[PDB]
């Protein structure tokens, strides 16, 4: 019984170690533009001013 209890405690401690390493790795994963900056207007490409819009100024 002593061995079983100690092993259960050690298993919970290893679970906590695994969780800590997992959160460390996830926090360092790069996020999508919607999640990191803007979830509704999700296109990073600007349009600029609309007044004298010149045919041929748009470039992909």
């Amino acid at each position: 019984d002593i061995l079983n209890e100690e092993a259960k405690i050690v298993q919970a401690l290893n679970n906590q170690r695994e969780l800590t390493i997992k959160m460390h790795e996830l926090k360092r994963e790069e996020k999508d533009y919607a999640h990191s900056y803007s979830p509704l207007f999700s296109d990073p490409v600007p349009q600029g001013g609309s007044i004298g819009k010149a045919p041929g100024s748009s470039r992909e």
């Binding site: 045919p55 041929g56 748009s58 470039r59 992909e60």
Partner: protein, 171 residues
Amino acid sequence: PREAAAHWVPFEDKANMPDNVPDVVEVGATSAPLLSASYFIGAKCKPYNDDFMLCREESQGSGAIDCLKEGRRVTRCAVSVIEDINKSCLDEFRLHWQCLEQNNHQLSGCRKAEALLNKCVFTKLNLEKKIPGLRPDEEPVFLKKDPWIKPAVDDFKSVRAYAEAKKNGTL
């Protein structure tokens, strides 16, 4: 593009166009006759103007050098309409742009000459003046009678010609 700043000099380029590029006529009208003809040019040359602008957009940066043939079409159509005006409706066209030259290039100052010009161009060229984007409720201003805004001096020759046309029955 911004206008030039503190010190600038104008410089002319003496080279010729590269011979590969087909030559084209250039429009010879100045600002007042062009403003007088602008609506007729729009009416006739809309497809070519639209094609030229669409080419420029699709070229995505190289538009000047990629749309030269489309630009050639645009300029030829403009020259054709101005030639037709010079052949069939020159007196009224001259009335209109001389009036414009007296009225700071404001169309509201030249409605009497413009009425004759529009009737002539419609009867002999089948072009119509029309303002895009209005609802049927909205009235185009150039067709409005009794406008709020009037010229300081109604143009002399234009007043006489308008009255004469009203006698003749043309207008």
